[PDB]
Amino acid sequence: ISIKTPEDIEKMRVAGRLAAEVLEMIEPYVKPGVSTGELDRICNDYIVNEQHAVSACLGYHGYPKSVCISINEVVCHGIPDDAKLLKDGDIVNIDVTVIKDGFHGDTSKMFIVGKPTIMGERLCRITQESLYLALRMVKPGINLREIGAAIQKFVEAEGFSVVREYCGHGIGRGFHEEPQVLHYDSRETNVVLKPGMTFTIEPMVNAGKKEIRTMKDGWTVKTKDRSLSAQYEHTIVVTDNGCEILTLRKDDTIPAIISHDE
Numbered sequence: 001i002s003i004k005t006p007e008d009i010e011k012m013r014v015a016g017r018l019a020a021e022v023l024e025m026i027e028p029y030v031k032p033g034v035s036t037g038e039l040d041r042i043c044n045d046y047i048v049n050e051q052h053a054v055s056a057c058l059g060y061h062g063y064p065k066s067v068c069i070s071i072n073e074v075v076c077h078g079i080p081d082d083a084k085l086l087k088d089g090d091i092v093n094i095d096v097t098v099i100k101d102g103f104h105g106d107t108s109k110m111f112i113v114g115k116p117t118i119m120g121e122r123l124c125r126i127t128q129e130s131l132y133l134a135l136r137m138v139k140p141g142i143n144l145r146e147i148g149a150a151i152q153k154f155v156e157a158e159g160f161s162v163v164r165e166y167c168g169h170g171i172g173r174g175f176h177e178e179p180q181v182l183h184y185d186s187r188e189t190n191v192v193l194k195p196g197m198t199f200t201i202e203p204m205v206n207a208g209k210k211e212i213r214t215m216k217d218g219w220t221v222k223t224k225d226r227s228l229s230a231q232y233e234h235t236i237v238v239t240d241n242g243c244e245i246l247t248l249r250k251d252d253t254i255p256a257i258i259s260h261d262e
């Protein structure tokens, strides 16, 4: 597994901040009646013309848009569409990845449009809380297995399920690098964290059953039972005594630097 230098890590601070700032920028546009196609153009224009960066998703394995915008029962990889309008009660993930100065920053959050439904709000909250509990566990010497097991235990106790596919991932000069960061317990996982590892945690949580389905368009992933699904993602670096969140936003309610030292 690659170990980032202080120079590499500073570049990941910059890229992570940019990816966060896309999400802070787009918020006032996420309203009933807006199209997801429009949101994607606003994001790409900002990334290119203001941040002077590029979207990692655009063209990636042929993907036609710059961000992924996933609504309701869509689990991930929702394709921005000029005809797809947001409406009251929708839960919406926007997942951003930018490359700046050769390094990637990858982050997503949920937006609830108009008046929340109670179940949508709870699903989003439990999903963020599962990410936060995982972030609290990251420090050198901990095994990724312990973190995946903990996300799953927490989510399942709420009556929700964890998507097994699409895991978190190492990240740096490459969009996806070792390790795989599973959001569930597996005997295969034996990665003892070391300072300078950079990776994402990005749990997808379904209100219903865990199983998923890819649509005929070749991209869009939905819950098999058409239950709601939510995701949040941060890029982090492991430090000598904990971690540092590289994609933190003003609306996050966890500190950027988490220290396990007395």
Ligand SMILES: COC(=O)CNC(=O)[C@H](C)NC(=O)[C@@H](O)[C@H](N)c1ccc(C(F)(F)F)cc1
Binding pocket: 057, 060, 061, 063, 068, 077, 095, 096, 097, 106, 107, 165, 166, 167, 168, 169, 202, 233
């Ligand atoms: C088996 O299919 C896969 O795992 C393809 N990879 C992913 O979906 C990975 C896990 N997704 C991520 O890392 C996301 O956080 C990331 N922002 C992203 C989102 C979409 C894509 C896509 F490939 F669809 F363009 C690639 C990467």
Ligand SMILES: [Co+2]
Binding pocket: 095, 096, 097, 106, 107, 108, 202, 233
């Ligand atoms: Co992402």
Ligand SMILES: [Co+2]
Binding pocket: 106, 168, 169, 200, 202, 233
């Ligand atoms: Co990712």
Ligand code: NA
Binding pocket: 070, 071, 072, 073, 074, 075, 076, 091, 093, 228, 229, 230
């Ligand atoms: Na969803």
